[PDB]
Amino acid sequence: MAEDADMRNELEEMQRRADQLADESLESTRRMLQLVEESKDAGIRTLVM
């Protein structure tokens, strides 16, 4: 031999990102954490009143 090979290689990016907006789905599921608590919080105390 008396052989040195030092090499590099390249990447294939994974799928599932047609557009970044997809993470806005998380902004949705934030909102259905946002839009859920006050329903019961006023529901049970609406039963109280």
Added chain:
Amino acid sequence: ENSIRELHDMFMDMAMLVESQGEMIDRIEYNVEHAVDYVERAVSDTKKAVK
């Protein structure tokens, strides 16, 4: 989330509506015993008007 928002609209309507009704219940709270405070107090003197 939109469907829960639709029921959320109906529910903030519901709860604030029955809230607002609670003031008519406040006027009951007036007209439930102040009504007695006239009536029972009047019949305390008509029943004793026989005396």
